[PDB]
Write an enzyme that holds these catalytic residues in place. Sequence first.
Site, PDB file in Angstrom:
ATOM      1  N   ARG A  20       0.478  -1.089  -0.013  1.00 50.71           N
ATOM      2  CA  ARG A  20       0.039   0.712   0.187  1.00 50.71           C
ATOM      3  C   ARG A  20       0.861   1.277   0.449  1.00 50.71           C
ATOM      4  NH1 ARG A  20      -1.835  -4.540  -0.359  1.00 50.71           N
ATOM      5  NH2 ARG A  20      -4.009  -4.928   0.710  1.00 50.71           N
ATOM      6  N   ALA A  66      -5.606   0.721  10.544  1.00 53.62           N
ATOM      7  CA  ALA A  66      -5.012   1.521  11.055  1.00 53.62           C
ATOM      8  C   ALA A  66      -5.318   2.661  11.949  1.00 53.62           C
ATOM      9  CB  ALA A  66      -3.655   1.963   9.659  1.00 53.62           C
ATOM     10  N   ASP A  87     -14.315  -6.225  15.017  1.00 55.51           N
ATOM     11  CA  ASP A  87     -14.136  -5.920  13.599  1.00 55.51           C
ATOM     12  C   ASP A  87     -13.801  -7.697  12.692  1.00 55.51           C
ATOM     13  OD1 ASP A  87     -12.229  -6.812  11.084  1.00 55.51           O
ATOM     14  OD2 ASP A  87     -11.047  -4.394  11.682  1.00 55.51           O
ATOM     15  N   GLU A 139      -3.208 -10.152   7.829  1.00 52.57           N
ATOM     16  CA  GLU A 139      -2.608 -10.316   6.856  1.00 52.57           C
ATOM     17  C   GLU A 139      -1.694  -9.318   6.895  1.00 52.57           C
ATOM     18  OE1 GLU A 139      -4.951  -9.191   3.646  1.00 52.57           O
ATOM     19  OE2 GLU A 139      -6.594 -10.829   3.934  1.00 52.57           O
ATOM     20  N   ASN A 171      -1.262  -5.519   5.792  1.00 55.73           N
ATOM     21  CA  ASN A 171      -1.980  -4.581   6.938  1.00 55.73           C
ATOM     22  C   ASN A 171      -0.546  -4.854   7.762  1.00 55.73           C
ATOM     23  OD1 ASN A 171      -4.425  -6.825   6.570  1.00 55.73           O
ATOM     24  ND2 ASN A 171      -3.875  -4.372   5.842  1.00 55.73           N
ATOM     25  N   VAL A 202     -20.655  -5.243  10.869  1.00 50.14           N
ATOM     26  CA  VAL A 202     -21.976  -4.120  11.633  1.00 50.14           C
ATOM     27  C   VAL A 202     -22.943  -3.569  10.072  1.00 50.14           C
ATOM     28  CG1 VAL A 202     -22.551  -1.231  11.925  1.00 50.14           C
ATOM     29  CG2 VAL A 202     -20.563  -2.668  12.704  1.00 50.14           C
ATOM     30  N   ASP A 211     -14.019   1.114   6.177  1.00 47.58           N
ATOM     31  CA  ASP A 211     -13.140   2.119   5.068  1.00 47.58           C
ATOM     32  C   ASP A 211     -13.992   1.783   3.260  1.00 47.58           C
ATOM     33  OD1 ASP A 211     -13.825  -1.054   4.352  1.00 47.58           O
ATOM     34  OD2 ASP A 211     -12.062  -1.532   4.447  1.00 47.58           O
ATOM     35  N   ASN A 212     -15.283   1.637   4.042  1.00 54.47           N
ATOM     36  CA  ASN A 212     -16.272   2.070   2.710  1.00 54.47           C
ATOM     37  C   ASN A 212     -17.228   3.098   3.066  1.00 54.47           C
ATOM     38  OD1 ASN A 212     -18.539  -0.590   3.756  1.00 54.47           O
ATOM     39  ND2 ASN A 212     -16.872  -0.858   4.880  1.00 54.47           N
ATOM     40  N   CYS A 231     -20.628  -0.962 -23.891  1.00 47.54           N
ATOM     41  CA  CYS A 231     -20.286  -0.536 -25.362  1.00 47.54           C
ATOM     42  C   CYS A 231     -18.126  -0.810 -25.368  1.00 47.54           C
ATOM     43  CB  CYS A 231     -21.308   0.269 -26.169  1.00 47.54           C
ATOM     44  SG  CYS A 231     -21.458   2.044 -25.834  1.00 47.54           S
TER      45      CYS A 231
HETATM   46  N1  LIG Z   1     -18.768  -3.392   7.806  1.00 43.91           N
HETATM   47  C1  LIG Z   1     -17.558  -3.014   8.704  1.00 43.91           C
HETATM   48  N2  LIG Z   1     -18.478  -3.513  10.167  1.00 43.91           N
HETATM   49  C2  LIG Z   1     -17.166  -3.767  10.666  1.00 43.91           C
HETATM   50  N3  LIG Z   1     -15.880  -3.886  10.344  1.00 43.91           N
HETATM   51  C3  LIG Z   1     -15.900  -3.193   8.886  1.00 43.91           C
HETATM   52  C4  LIG Z   1     -16.482  -3.320   8.116  1.00 43.91           C
HETATM   53  N4  LIG Z   1     -16.109  -3.072   6.873  1.00 43.91           N
HETATM   54  C5  LIG Z   1     -14.798  -2.344   7.164  1.00 43.91           C
HETATM   55  N5  LIG Z   1     -14.207  -3.053   8.437  1.00 43.91           N
HETATM   56  C6  LIG Z   1     -13.464  -3.662   8.457  1.00 43.91           C
HETATM   57  O1  LIG Z   1     -12.496  -1.808   8.428  1.00 43.91           O
HETATM   58  C7  LIG Z   1     -11.268  -2.221   8.891  1.00 43.91           C
HETATM   59  C8  LIG Z   1     -10.593  -1.207   7.411  1.00 43.91           C
HETATM   60  O2  LIG Z   1      -9.192  -1.259   7.728  1.00 43.91           O
HETATM   61  P1  LIG Z   1      -8.512  -0.877   6.964  1.00 43.91           P
HETATM   62  O3  LIG Z   1      -9.043  -0.765   5.235  1.00 43.91           O
HETATM   63  O4  LIG Z   1      -7.067  -0.526   7.032  1.00 43.91           O
HETATM   64  O5  LIG Z   1      -7.907  -2.583   6.310  1.00 43.91           O
HETATM   65  P2  LIG Z   1      -8.273  -3.419   5.174  1.00 43.91           P
HETATM   66  O6  LIG Z   1      -9.262  -3.583   4.512  1.00 43.91           O
HETATM   67  O7  LIG Z   1      -8.472  -4.649   5.577  1.00 43.91           O
HETATM   68  O8  LIG Z   1      -6.693  -3.418   4.585  1.00 43.91           O
HETATM   69  P3  LIG Z   1      -6.502  -2.906   2.766  1.00 43.91           P
HETATM   70  O9  LIG Z   1      -8.042  -2.051   2.059  1.00 43.91           O
HETATM   71  O10 LIG Z   1      -5.311  -2.357   2.882  1.00 43.91           O
HETATM   72  O11 LIG Z   1      -6.260  -3.812   1.901  1.00 43.91           O
HETATM   73  C9  LIG Z   1     -10.959  -4.073   8.881  1.00 43.91           C
HETATM   74  O12 LIG Z   1     -10.779  -4.313   9.830  1.00 43.91           O
HETATM   75  C10 LIG Z   1     -12.340  -3.959   8.118  1.00 43.91           C
HETATM   76  O13 LIG Z   1     -12.754  -5.275   8.826  1.00 43.91           O
HETATM   77 MG   LIG Z   2      -9.595  -1.702   2.691  1.00 46.23          MG
HETATM   78 MG   LIG Z   3      -7.789  -7.177   5.445  1.00 43.88          MG
END
Ligand SMILES: Nc1ncnc2c1ncn2[C@@H]1O[C@H](COP(=O)(O)OP(=O)(O)OP(=O)(O)O)[C@@H](O)[C@H]1O
Ligand SMILES: [Mg+2]
Ligand SMILES: [Mg+2]
Lengths: 985, 147
Positions: A9, A424, A450, A455, A458, A500, A524-525, A580
């Site tokens: 990353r 992180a 979580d 990995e 990470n 969650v 992260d989403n 297309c």
């Molecule tokens: N809906 C959710 N409920 C709980 N935890 C979540 C949810 N969506 C994401 N997470 C957690 O949020 C954290 C996001 O941290 P981070 O994006 O740095 O890690 P990662 O996605 O495992 O790594 P990378 O994006 O570098 O491949 C991860 O532990 C992911 O499991």
């Molecule tokens: Mg992520």
């Molecule tokens: Mg992961």
Amino acid sequence: TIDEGLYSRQLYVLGHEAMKQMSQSNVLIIGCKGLGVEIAKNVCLAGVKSVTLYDPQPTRIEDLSSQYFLTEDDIGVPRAKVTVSKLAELNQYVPVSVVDELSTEYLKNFKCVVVTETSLTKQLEINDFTHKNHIAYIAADSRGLFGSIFCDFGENFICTDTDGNEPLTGMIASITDDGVVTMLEETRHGLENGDFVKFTEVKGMPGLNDGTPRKVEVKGPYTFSIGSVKDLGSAGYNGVFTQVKVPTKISFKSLRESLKDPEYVYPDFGKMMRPPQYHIAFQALSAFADAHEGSLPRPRNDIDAAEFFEFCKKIASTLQFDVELDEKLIKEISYQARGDLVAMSAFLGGAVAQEVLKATTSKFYPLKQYFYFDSLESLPSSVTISEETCKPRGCRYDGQIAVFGSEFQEKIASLSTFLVGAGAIGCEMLKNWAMMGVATGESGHISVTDMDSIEKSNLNRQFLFRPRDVGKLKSECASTAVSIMNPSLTGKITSYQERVGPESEGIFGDEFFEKLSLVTNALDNVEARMYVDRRCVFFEKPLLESGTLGTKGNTQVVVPHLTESYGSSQDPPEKSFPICTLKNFPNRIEHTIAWARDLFEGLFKQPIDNVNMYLSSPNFLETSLKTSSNPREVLENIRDYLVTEKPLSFEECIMWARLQFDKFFNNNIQQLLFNFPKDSVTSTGQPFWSGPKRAPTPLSFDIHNREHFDFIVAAASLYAFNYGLKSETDPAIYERVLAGYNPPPFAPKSGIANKDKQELKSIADSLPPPSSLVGFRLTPAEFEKDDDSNHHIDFITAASNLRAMNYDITPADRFKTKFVAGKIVPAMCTSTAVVSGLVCLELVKLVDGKKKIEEYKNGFFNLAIGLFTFSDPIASPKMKVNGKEIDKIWDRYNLPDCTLQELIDYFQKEEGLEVTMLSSGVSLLYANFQPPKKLAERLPLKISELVEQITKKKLEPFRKHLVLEICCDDANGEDVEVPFICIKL
Amino acid sequence: ALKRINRELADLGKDPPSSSSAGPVGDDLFHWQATIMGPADSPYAGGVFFLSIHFPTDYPFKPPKVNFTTRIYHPNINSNGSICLDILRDQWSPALTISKVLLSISSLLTDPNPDDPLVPEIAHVYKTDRSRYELSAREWTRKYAIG
Ligand SMILES: Nc1ncnc2c1ncn2[C@@H]1O[C@H](COP(=O)(O)OP(=O)(O)OP(=O)(O)O)[C@@H](O)[C@H]1O
Ligand SMILES: [Mg+2]
Ligand SMILES: [Mg+2]
């Protein structure tokens, strides 16, 4: 030799050359307190050649306020000697050492020198040497809620990249004889004045293809100017331009020179008169320490404040600073001189570590030169802060008590927080909570959830995890690590493994959410963020959102009944290419990568799913024949993967891979060129293959070529994996098997009742019955970018590069293919540290229960350019309902579980509104336009019974409320918005 | 989201589309089944085409997924029902109503765009042999789009 399995990353932010130059640099760090240890941690995780520590001062108790590598058993031992051992574990490629004594000439051994907790005389002595020998010198200081950074990289610093952005590139429609370059339709080049560009693939003006950069004179959002191209030609048709980035020369000044005439960096534009005050204040702090045997002013002491202000006056007179001193702010700096906060330490450590990386890699634009920061808005106002409350109590929280007092410490110790995610930002937040003493009281508690596992990649920015922890759950490891850091958090932390979302409302229900004090997102989403935001809005809990992207970051605070929620703001969505474009006419490597991913899914995943479902579901064929879009496709896949093309040995897998090569890179292109010949013209007479459409050409299989062999190997290996065969990698077997292959003839076809059902039935009865095949299952291929031995990214890269060779697109390497196909988000440890610091600075505002909206600050920053900005949150929109003030976001209706008719009558009689639509979840419970019979059947039923009947699903026993969305019209027929309804079951 | 969807549904109910009829499936607001009538001045005359509309959770900040269900012989519509409409992939903005999408699809049925096709064979037939294209379109709309 970069270990791309660990720095995956980080390489997408810095790059291969930057990290190669970074792995040959030595960093010396003077001072091993919270700020120094933060800087050292970030540098070690970054990957510099080595780190040397120098701090012979014996450990004391107050040092534990922000030093997380110190325990109470280390009192009386030098800080460096007890920090080196714990820092040597963060990264195995970065040795960490300790020097007992520091001499001037020794400084020549290092590439960067970071100085903290050092008096101004020693800083001048060090800088006078590190300036004339071309050694980068960074000096950082943290006093209470105030911080300072000073950078000096020499008189001839060379900065190759000044903003961190990818070079701009684009397609050209036409270039005139006057240098006026025009982009394609609705395409903005984005160039700025003074840039340099180079042109390639230009028709009619070959001279511009030499590669010489040319000036840019922007004339509009779509056209710019390059100068005079009269000699080369008269007009140029089409072509692609790419920006050229030139190195910049930055000249710094020494500390002794810049004390008199500093050059400030302003982290905020609302308070631009302060940095001149802080410049005098910090020098007065140094003088006061020098005049009291290194003793800083006592916390909230008036005599020391007066003496410090006298020193400030003397300094401002000596330096001929024509600035009036603000007595209140200067005395505030005096009061918090002994403060030591983990949030400020994290923020400044992230910033200084980024500065160190800039110094070593000669990348990004550095700070120039003084950076003075303060978060004085975080000082509590609802508690007593005086000399009596702020005196040290002989505990590890002295550095924080000296700023906030003991009463606010008791307020912090009784927090009941909820942290979502343990990435992180989650690790940094947990460290900050452990250091601040959050939830160490009787009524405190911490909950962290979580569902992911640790990995290898990470570990580069999540410092609570170790290589021995790879494969374990993030939440458990984080809780154990932070209980190790702060022993008082034993039994006060609960770690879940639940995602969650809608399915986890049985655990995070009303009972769980009603005891919390605040929620912190480390996700992260966007989907999870929106869900958590809705839950916090319903339960009226403060929320702390934080996000990072490479070197950019932002933090936002949501306060009940004060500010708007997270979902009230919209972000730019993802860009998806037209179907297309991907299917037939790609023109960029992204299109071919997307096509390769679709090919992977359709070759190794969907047919296997269909075969498995056929052998499991007894009535699958009938359902598919009337439900699936293409029953013929499903039947053909089943037949081909069960009987027709079932491999018995790996040689048959190789033959299948060769056949697929012919199918996808030689025959479909022939068909496309038969439909649209290369010399065809559109309906308007223009040539068809012009502009965004590139004429393809079939590929002939050459075994010696690398890309063809890579595709064959990857495809055969994946097919064998699907059928559970034995794969091999020796080229000899491939060359032997593929030598004796006869390509079946192919000629493009021009084309030219109920019998189709007969053919489908004939295909169906040719399939083996499920009973004859019991226990036979085909293993699908689930995409996994992080494993390098599954041939996923290898196959995607090979297919993408072969399709690029079809359309004469420039192929990309496996690195860029993994970045694009995997949707990897670039990440850094420094950005994580900065966002955690900002969030923990907002947390103390949330704890104090500040009411005014001007006292909270959403934050944004970009570390590639050294930009920091803070803006007030947006107030929640109001509305008028029945001549009353209603908050749009934080107001709701509370009603019993009455019948639908009673709900309508209540809204008609109380609010004077006519209900026209009522929905719950994703279901339409009631609408004004429904036929009368349906309403008469639905009106006298209770809301819970109505929901159960419509949704065809009983309410769970843990369900205690219903959130209903209602749209109603006023008496005159005008639409009026109203808050949602909270039915109490 | 739900409020916007219901506003669009009521607007369709208040003003009839005449050439279209969109409504929720069962009682789900995020899944609609619309009907389009073949234009008179087109080979698809006297035909009924069924479309499935899937509203994303982020509506109207994300485009709805519109897919044909009845088989149609059109250059811009492939065998899976996917429609080559620019306003549904990347030109989508939170200001477009379902009535606008249905009108755009009806206009697309009125005149195809063979210069940027989705089914190259049908586009080639349309550009070269127009009469065969018309005959094939009529055959398809009589075999699939009727009864
Ligand atoms: N809906 C959710 N409920 C709980 N935890 C979540 C949810 N969506 C994401 N997470 C957690 O949020 C954290 C996001 O941290 P981070 O994006 O740095 O890690 P990662 O996605 O495992 O790594 P990378 O994006 O570098 O491949 C991860 O532990 C992911 O499991
Ligand atoms: Mg992520
Ligand atoms: Mg992961």
